[PDB]
Design an enzyme around this catalytic site. Sequence first.
Site, PDB file in Angstrom:
ATOM      1  CB  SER B  49      -0.937   0.000   1.212  1.00 43.89           C
ATOM      2  OG  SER B  49      -0.217  -0.167   2.419  1.00 43.89           O
ATOM      3  CG  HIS B 161       9.657 -11.135   9.154  1.00 41.49           C
ATOM      4  ND1 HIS B 161       9.424 -10.180   8.188  1.00 41.49           N
ATOM      5  CD2 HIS B 161       9.714 -10.472  10.333  1.00 41.49           C
ATOM      6  CE1 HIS B 161       9.346  -8.990   8.759  1.00 41.49           C
ATOM      7  NE2 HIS B 161       9.518  -9.141  10.060  1.00 41.49           N
ATOM      8  CD  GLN B 169      12.336 -12.903   1.114  1.00 41.83           C
ATOM      9  OE1 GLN B 169      11.628 -13.008   0.110  1.00 41.83           O
ATOM     10  NE2 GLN B 169      12.547 -11.744   1.721  1.00 41.83           N
ATOM     11  CD  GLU B 170      11.337 -16.648  -1.837  1.00 36.65           C
ATOM     12  OE1 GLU B 170      11.389 -17.182  -2.964  1.00 36.65           O
ATOM     13  OE2 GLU B 170      10.484 -15.784  -1.540  1.00 36.65           O
ATOM     14  CD  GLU B 213       6.687 -17.500  -0.553  1.00 38.86           C
ATOM     15  OE1 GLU B 213       7.636 -18.205  -0.960  1.00 38.86           O
ATOM     16  OE2 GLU B 213       6.493 -16.329  -0.944  1.00 38.86           O
ATOM     17  CG  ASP B 248      13.978 -14.195  -3.451  1.00 35.44           C
ATOM     18  OD1 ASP B 248      14.726 -13.228  -3.717  1.00 35.44           O
ATOM     19  OD2 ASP B 248      12.780 -14.047  -3.146  1.00 35.44           O
ATOM     20  CD  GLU B 289      13.129 -13.539  -6.642  1.00 32.35           C
ATOM     21  OE1 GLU B 289      12.877 -14.754  -6.808  1.00 32.35           O
ATOM     22  OE2 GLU B 289      12.329 -12.745  -6.102  1.00 32.35           O
ATOM     23  CG  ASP B 314      10.956  -9.784  -6.791  1.00 32.83           C
ATOM     24  OD1 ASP B 314      10.062  -9.004  -7.181  1.00 32.83           O
ATOM     25  OD2 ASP B 314      10.779 -10.590  -5.851  1.00 32.83           O
ATOM     26  CE  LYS B 339       7.018 -10.827  -6.109  1.00 39.43           C
ATOM     27  NZ  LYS B 339       7.803 -10.133  -5.042  1.00 39.43           N
ATOM     28  CG  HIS B 367       4.125 -17.253  -4.910  1.00 39.21           C
ATOM     29  ND1 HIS B 367       4.182 -18.288  -4.000  1.00 39.21           N
ATOM     30  CD2 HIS B 367       5.374 -16.727  -4.956  1.00 39.21           C
ATOM     31  CE1 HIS B 367       5.410 -18.384  -3.519  1.00 39.21           C
ATOM     32  NE2 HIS B 367       6.154 -17.448  -4.083  1.00 39.21           N
ATOM     33  NE  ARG B 368       3.991  -9.765  -4.032  1.00 36.15           N
ATOM     34  CZ  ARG B 368       3.804  -8.448  -3.948  1.00 36.15           C
ATOM     35  NH1 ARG B 368       3.057  -7.814  -4.843  1.00 36.15           N
ATOM     36  NH2 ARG B 368       4.385  -7.759  -2.975  1.00 36.15           N
ATOM     37  CB  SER B 369       4.280 -13.082   1.200  1.00 31.82           C
ATOM     38  OG  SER B 369       5.666 -13.050   0.933  1.00 31.82           O
ATOM     39  CE  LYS B 390       9.585 -16.207  -5.974  1.00 30.62           C
ATOM     40  NZ  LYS B 390      10.628 -15.334  -5.339  1.00 30.62           N
TER      41      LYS B 390
END
Lengths: 427, 427
Positions: B49, B161, B169-170, B213, B248, B289, B314, B339, B367-369, B390
């Site tokens: 947002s 997180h 991250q991934e 995910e 990622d 990524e 990304d 995305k 996709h998104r989280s 992904k």
Amino acid sequence: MLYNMDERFEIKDIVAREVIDSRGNPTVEVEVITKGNGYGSAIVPSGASTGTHEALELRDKEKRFGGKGVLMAVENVNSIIRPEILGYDARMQREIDTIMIELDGTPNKSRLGANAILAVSLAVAKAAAATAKIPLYKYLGGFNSYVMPVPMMNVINGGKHAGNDLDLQEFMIMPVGATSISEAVRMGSEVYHVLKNVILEKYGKNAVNVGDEGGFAPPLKTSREALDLLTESVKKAGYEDEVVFALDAAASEFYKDGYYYVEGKKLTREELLDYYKALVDEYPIVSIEDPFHEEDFEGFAMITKELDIQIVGDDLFVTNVERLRKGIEMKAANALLLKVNQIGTLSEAVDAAQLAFRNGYGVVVSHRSGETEDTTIADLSVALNSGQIKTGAPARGERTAKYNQLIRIEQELGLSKYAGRNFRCPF
Amino acid sequence: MLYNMDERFEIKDIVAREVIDSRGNPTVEVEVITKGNGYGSAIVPSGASTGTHEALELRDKEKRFGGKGVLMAVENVNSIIRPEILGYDARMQREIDTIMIELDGTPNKSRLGANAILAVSLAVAKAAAATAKIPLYKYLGGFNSYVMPVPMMNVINGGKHAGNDLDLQEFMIMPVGATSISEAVRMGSEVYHVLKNVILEKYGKNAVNVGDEGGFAPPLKTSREALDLLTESVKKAGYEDEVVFALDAAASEFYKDGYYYVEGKKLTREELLDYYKALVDEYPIVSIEDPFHEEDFEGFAMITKELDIQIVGDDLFVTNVERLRKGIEMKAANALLLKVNQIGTLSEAVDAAQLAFRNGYGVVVSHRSGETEDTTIADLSVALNSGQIKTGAPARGERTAKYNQLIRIEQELGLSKYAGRNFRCPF
């Protein structure tokens, strides 16, 4: 009556395929289309391929997918069931379910597979409704289907596979005070998020990953700690007066050689009963699922008579009519946990629900640990006006998909009724 | 031409509603139906947002749902967008997307909300396809849509997180050696379950809960530890020669004042590059990524030139055509992470994909989280013949629903091509 004959409802084609569930395990999906172009599709959740009284799924037990493939069940639909029901009137649900039950030949559907049979059973119903152009829940339960269920959300996980030291399996919240299913879902989500942050602040950033049903597994060891955490979260969320608790003890899991091992103590049935009594006196617990082991009918009758809350039989009945009937005669429990894939067909499932209802029992339409994106149980809960549903924490798509479907059904109904505090009998 | 005019494609009605995503947060769902009874429905994933380069979702910022409600976005669809496109030819996708873009009037769709606009954009395309009676992927990409994508599965999570001490991250597995999407999903699932058991036996029963995910977050501290675990799992699963790795890094997350903080060290861009290079030399990592922060075009160009693998932009591109063009001119990265909700409309998303494709860049449909039961990206990856997707670990319904859709598309095609090792350019 000849005026009811309509070629449009004839089944034109049926196709089954192997897809995967929310845990990455194979499961069956079936598509059905009528001559009138009415389309229905359903995916069954995972169940058991071995068990003493429930309907049994057929698993391939081959090298692939750790022996959990369902290619055989899929082939049974495409090559064995299909030819027997092609061209059949899709409206004849009971006749089609009976044809499958008889074709299998065994009481527990172990030959063709409860997964193959149920997938077809659900897809046929959806295709018939689609052909008639009647909302699914209206087709399943008649014109008078309008009660939105109170969701029992498993937000705190316990048991041996949860990760923590909690003995009881599920600690759930029930927004009985909400005024709509839309509001109920929001209250549940808000409490879930407050809970997540309380856990994060108190136990660290490594304590908020989720279990199979989307709930959390904080490092707790006593039921009071779990219930205190829920109370703290509910109060902080601002729904102290609209949210009550429900428990799934799954007591068979911590029962062994005559005793229940709870919080480092060996308890007899009577001692566990007093254990439950104290919790109910200290917290707004309105329902307890499987308080004793799966064969202790007497124990269930005792707690059902002694406490003034809902006592749900899950493993006690395994959605088996014969066992439910025995429970009713003994006044064992006062609610049935309804798992459609434990019985095998829509016809049987609804017959089981009716037997429960007609003897004063509540019916809790339930999900399975291994779920899918299929949302049939949402429509089923409304069709049966069950007043209650158990389909997970408000997280993970295989759970949230049901909540969204409940929201859609509520909006589609012109006038609906949220079961609320009258979740046992919403009439 | 007059013969192409057809009232059946006119949009008859549009309805938006607020549902919840896989994390329990509100999101927008839109339904569209044409006069010819072609029905389409879509739900958009979580977005952002606030931002300065990507399309912004509209959130209510009210007390309810922790300020994440989307009732305004929903009203924008039902009261603002709806009247402007009712009766419009659903086949005119670019025209409808343009109408919404101009109606909003802002460069980042921040007035009506990227979530409101995309939901309509997607639902319209589905309704048009349904009206034409052309499979969605065929309607989106033309008759020549037949390439099934290689899935990048995030099975080991890292980041601030994730719960552990992993900086990246991934950590994903890519079944490039599979011969079909069906087999690819199976391979992924099997490796995933082997991984789960290895984590259980090594770290205990409290270490297998999952992240957003569906991946696990074992108590690891270094990339090598994570990669060794994947290597060990892949080997035990028996797919040493069919499964490779993808990373990622999401490097912006650990970048600060010119330095990258990795594994208790403070590294410069160049040192981090050697860090990645050493990993690639030790493990079958075929794609990385966001190796550097979101504004380091120069850095991306450097690693893209020095290494001989896929470098995905990304956060660097945030699915923004202008940023992608800049990257192409600088030879920064050689793949785009697509995305759709980061840009806002189907038309713009596909234009971004084409710009990438036509300049030798790969395209990873993502996709998104916060996902939903919507499976549009599955059809989109095939429509674009991207060769790669992904969409999560093979667990959690919001992820498995995409894999199931890919399996369905592959079966419907009859003749399909699994990108396999030619995932970058499957032609």
